[PDB]
DNA sequence: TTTTTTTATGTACTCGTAGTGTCTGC
DNA sequence: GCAGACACTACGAGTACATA
């Protein structure tokens, strides 16, 4: 069936959206807002299997029409998926233009057509802007589908003409119960990983299943080593990687939990590791702690913003910046205007 | 297969020909003049008809026409001069070469010319079959420190007198670009057949046309010589490599140097270089490089470098290449910047 | 691919479809912003299978009677499908069975049925494009006009193959210019009577039209300089062409 | 298979007559004066923010230029040419998806056939949408045709922003800046549309949809269509309030007063409670900025509060009494900078926490 | 007669005699002197910002060269060749829209055809417009012909950014830079255009159009046509002001004076008046910044005020005399920060209100008093 | 004579190489270019390259003097130094500019036509404003801003050059000969402000110019922004 | 002695190849 | 006839360059 396994919390929204697509008053451009890995793409695939099914019933595809076997076979001339090319993290304007020009003709099968964009935010500005005038005035029986982490990042014009359908991550008790049903280790680290993932159970599942957990353990051990001594340089050995911004996010999360502990907040994101946050609060002044926080976040967004930048250099310069900030009598950054 | 130097390839050329010849190595001009010497030696000998073939993938072997059929009006033997691709050939071409050798006539000579090949390309079927009788020879341009002796030796071979100042200005202006060096030597010889050139007009007949690969750039910046670094950057003009290569280079050595300074309190710098075998001709040039610095100095360097790193790639700056002039010069006379930049 | 409804059957020699397509293929759009402009319009009438091709500035419509009752239906077929269909025509003895659908065009030739996807658009009303008054009408020998236009066009402007008719009483004057100024003038004796008039227009298009129809005696109809010219053969009215003027 | 496919409001209610357009009084008056008086021009570019109507104004102008009545200020709407332009069949209105058809090849192709007379209409209108994504060569190719086109061809440009165009093209067209539509115009148009569409609506819900659209008919109308899916058949205040994530409660000013008094624990507790309830963060900081503005304004001139501000005056005037004038502006600047950096933060809640901690860093004594 | 055709002011009023030009001296004089002295150089490039006359100057010079009589600096408007180039599509003027001719496949054809002699007049004038759009191979192809063209070929190259050209092309041909026009010249041209158009006009509206034209005459003429459309066929200060969005309404000097006098109530009243007027706030802020800048410039040197701004010069001088430079800098920085933060303000009116309030309360000589302690 | 060889296609270069390797003895053929780096190394190595140097200012000046004396045109020396300086070294450039000078000067290349050219050849502007910032010179700042406005160079680049000059000045303050090769023609005036001005004032000026650049694009006009930067710099000391 | 390491999108040019009009002594 | 010449025109690829 769906590539990503069905998630139980996605059932209600499905029905609601199916309702909007049964009366014929679907918006033909249903920009899904869901946290990455939470199951936005699964919902898109279920919906598109419904729509491109020329013989559906109720609220679920027949699964018997040979259109459905084309769907499960992964090949269909009325199903245009736009994904980044293998090895490149952006989908070009060439692919979007090809899809739009191919969508010009009728439906091959005597039914509807669906263009599904794998991730809206990854669109190049030229590519995204070339998708206008095709989802604003689409051909008859044309449906679009887009998924994103945060709609505000998109181009303003493109977001303007798309029905922004939100998905809420499940309540933390339900999410931790599901994780414990699927994932095995302690509930404390489970909750910590869930919080690190902005509340998305799928990303916490991905962090635990992958090697990211052992990487986080090594990084937190290195932090425990570095904080009393001030040898932040060693942390480079755990930061420089293909997935560097995620670990920088972990570091910033630790810093913010330290600042909250200084303010005495009861609930913290890194609750699984009280020793680290306690040490961070003890050894670092809040005035310099917020400076460390700001530079960490700035460098994170620079790593994740500009494509193909030398992560090693920026990470090491960050580490040297903390080295300077540890030294007393230094000017601290102020968020500029 | 012998893997010798052309100073001996001349000796094997003077003696009986050892079947196919393969001269390799990236050469500014030495490859072409060695080819010319081979051509004249062959012309003195039997083989005279030099058929030029460009070895390349997706290009069929028209050489088989010469290989299968013998010349009919003037046989006079003949020589197939093969031009290898800059990355080396593929397996199909490597085996078709063996097929050609199977088609080799007694009056046929095989000359294969190219750059250094990969081990699989080096140990292909054709080379393995030709390892019994053919020869292999390689050469490379002289280094910066090896230039003056080579230039003086060439001048003495050409029967023209040079001077220390003339050699200095030549090795500065023509550093590793032997074609330009040879043309300048001929120009100085023809301009004045007096045979005495000390420093009268050698600069007048010599321009600034030389290659400059990035590895030497830090070699100046580590001394912090303002005028020397500025002149090196001005020399880099008109052969301007895109900034990313230079940036990768200096970020490599500065990360290495900052790691070295962090570990300097630990195991000494020599045994630390034992890990950092970057072959900077001794690993001791870096040893005298690390003598003149400070931790705050490294901070001031890394701040500017990392600010440039986002200055060229985040927003595609156009002055960023000239920014390489800015970053290298400011470090020369900056013991430690009292913040005021802290980028 | 499955079968389709709204599927009227045709029985016609391949020569009929070949004549039709060859009559209205040179005036079919090629990579133009108007997406419906590509391909040919096949429209079914009780009288014929009319076909319409246009670039927006060459409107060629052919009408070969079919002898069968045809429910009114209008279709647009893209350029690729039309070219392939014309390639699959030969022989002239086998009956071609053209099967129309909502989104596809199928065709049975001999023992093979081939299909083509169908452009989604609403093609313009060609009848309104055709001029509403043929007040100035002239007839002239087809081959004579073709030869004269070729002669004039050999000095015409290269990028804009543009000549100018000057129609006077029983006389056609062709005048052509180009960069590196060269003037080509040619006078033809025609069967014309009416108001003196001049009109500039592309000559490649008119040469193409005359090549397509190639009758004994052509006649064209026209009113004013801005007005488009409607050219057909004087024998029948099965094929009509519309050429839009140069200048203004 | 609905009526064509525009069961969505965004396409169904695009105006068909200059009388049916909302706002844009200056540009509509200018176009009507030009059409009726006879002063016509070959190149108009309409520049304005998204969802204001530059495409619609351009198409309506194209209708008005080619109506069989003559060059009429108000298009017929019933005559054959207007019907054809509505269907898109009209062979002289050459619309261009210039964002999609960017290559200079196609610009040259469409410029070669400019000399031809129009097929049926008076003028051969070259409507170009999203002009700003033309490649530089295409922009410069359009130059000599934009400047002195033949007598019968007229260009229309419809770009999101004007400053990306080269200054050469920007100096050869009439720059009509479409003024963004204020809240009242949006509310009136939305109420009229809903009354035509026969679905019950509440005035305050329409006020929310107007104030959240930031001046755009397309944005507000899409938001209403989203609410119709949520609020069954009706744009109800509760449903749109929950969907839009508005700050119905008073926790906004509560965490304002917690933040200005350097109560980190209280601010964190309020943030945790709001995140648990399901708040939206951008609206939170917008409300912060508004409340701070009201506090500062009554700090300067009292009796400036209105409605809800005039009701919570008991707290607002006390805050204006206790907070110095200098620190109010600093809090406002910090909050607005945080709102600026909300997109550049992996988690929205984490971004708001960062902003609040930056604000509390002004007085981080305890 | 008045010839009521209503066809685009820009195209109707393109200069046709050598004297109708707006007042470019350093290029018109040079061209006239060259044509008088017989020094007709075979290739020269006109540069300058958009809509100054370079494409027009090229047409005038081709008119002058190919006149029926001897080469005359001031072309006649009666001979067949001048009439033809006047009407366009002239036989010997080959106007090449180089932006449409960039492939070398066409420049090669051009250099192929260049040899054949012209039929009428003396020269054949290759007016290659938008030169900078030619592809590199086309430039290199043109190089040898430009160095030594035949006797009867002149190359009229015109472009907007000559720095894009390969430097050798700049070397081959002369270089005439056309300076952007002054406000007085452009206003005089607008007066002439409207007077000949028999359209009533108001001096303030013409000054507004000249100011907003950014020193390029076609911008002013397009704006004049747009204002003629905006009004009921007449150019009025009210129509131009409302169409441009300028703040001539209630000026802006009242707002800045209320700022320096620290009267919050006056600022509020002016803000409410502007809001009822429905003005855009960013334009108001830009006006305030410009006022501050002019005040500072006058404080450095009283001759900085423009003649177009001679309406409020006394109060301008007084504000320059009173406010110390540091307060002016503080106001400028505060208002500039406000303008930067306007897109991120909760509302443009509210953001401008707080920017005014911040620049008021931080005024050192009269700050907003601390409430209690 | 195959002029401008750098435009030959790759296969064209291969044909040229096959002709050069076995050239007929009875023929030769020259060759010319402007960007020699584009030729293949084989043909460059084969050909006996001569490199032709850019003309010096004195060479161009004397040649132009001779040319003007040859036909009939009177000339004054300062105009000729100006023409040579603006020629940037190319003799053909000097001849094109002397044609323009003759045209504007009505058959006489006097100092006034080349003064009209002076608006184009006037280059040294960024250093004078830096020198005039550290004090109140009166009309110097107004004249320089008028020149910048009438010249319309990139204001962002102008202020970046200002910042670079000021930063190297601060570098010289902490090192008596920090660059040395910076502005060899102004090694007798720039040094005074390189050492006399206190480093604290230099840091404050750097702060002012950095703040001005950071806020420059948001000014009503970039000319107004640079004016305000200059006024702020002149406001303090 | 083998050593790190930016893109998307567009525009030209020149070399094969492939397909097709047209027509010439075969 | 006529197929093969012979021309001619269009398309892909490999390369060089530009600009954001
Ligand atoms: N001025 C207006 N009057 C009426 N409806 C408008 C107006 N502006 C926008 N709309 C609505 O917005 C929808 C899209 O308008 P459109 O003209 O495409 O905006 P854009 O300028 O961004 O392309 C229209 O279908 C119409 O419902
Ligand atoms: N010097 C001038 N005198 C009069 N009108 C001018 C002048 N320069 C520009 N214009 C106006 O601009 C219109 C187009 O000018 P144009 O010469 O095309 O400028 P460009 O140099 O950018 O091609 C003209 O029709 C004319 O009205
Ligand atoms: F800006 Be609109 F959505 F075309
Ligand atoms: F409008 Be101009 F030729 F820049
Ligand atoms: Mg639009
Ligand atoms: Mg022009
Ligand atoms: Zn099914
Ligand atoms: Zn005349």
Author numbering:
A (entry chain E): -2 to 334
B (entry chain A): 1 to 343
C (entry chain G): 119 to 366
D (entry chain D): -2 to 363
E (entry chain C): -2 to 370
F (entry chain B): 124 to 360
Verbatim from the authors:
Clamp loaders are pentameric ATPases that place circular sliding clamps onto DNA, where they function in DNA replication and genome integrity. Because the sliding clamp is a closed ring in solution, it needs to be opened and placed onto DNA by a separate ATPase complex called the clamp loader. All clamp loaders are pentameric ATPases of the AAA + family (ATPases associated with various cellular activities). Here we describe a series of structures of the E. coli clamp loader in the process of placing the clamp onto a p/t-junction.
A surprising class of DNA-primed particles exhibits an open clamp structure, but the collar region is in a different conformation from all other γ-complex structures reported herein or elsewhere. The collar region of the B subunit shifts upward away from the AAA+ spiral. The collar regions of the C, D, and E subunits are static, and the A subunit only moves slightly. The movement of the collar opens a large pore between the A and B subunits. Moreover, this movement alters the center of the collar at the binding site for the ψ protein, an accessory factor that, together with the χ protein, acts as an adaptor linking the clamp loader to the single-stranded binding protein (SSB). The Altered-Collar state shifts the binding site such that it is incompatible with the known binding pose of the ψ protein. We attribute this structure to an off- or parallel-pathway intermediate and discuss potential implications for the Altered-Collar conformational changes in the Discussion. The Altered-Collar state observed here severely disrupts the ψ protein binding site, suggesting that this conformation is incompatible with ψ protein binding. It is possible that the Altered-Collar state functions as a means for disengaging the clamp loader’s linkage to SSB through the ψ protein. Because the E. coli clamp loader can readily load ß-clamp onto nicked DNA, we speculate that this pore could function as a channel for the unwound primer strand of nicked DNA to exit the central chamber, similar to RFC.
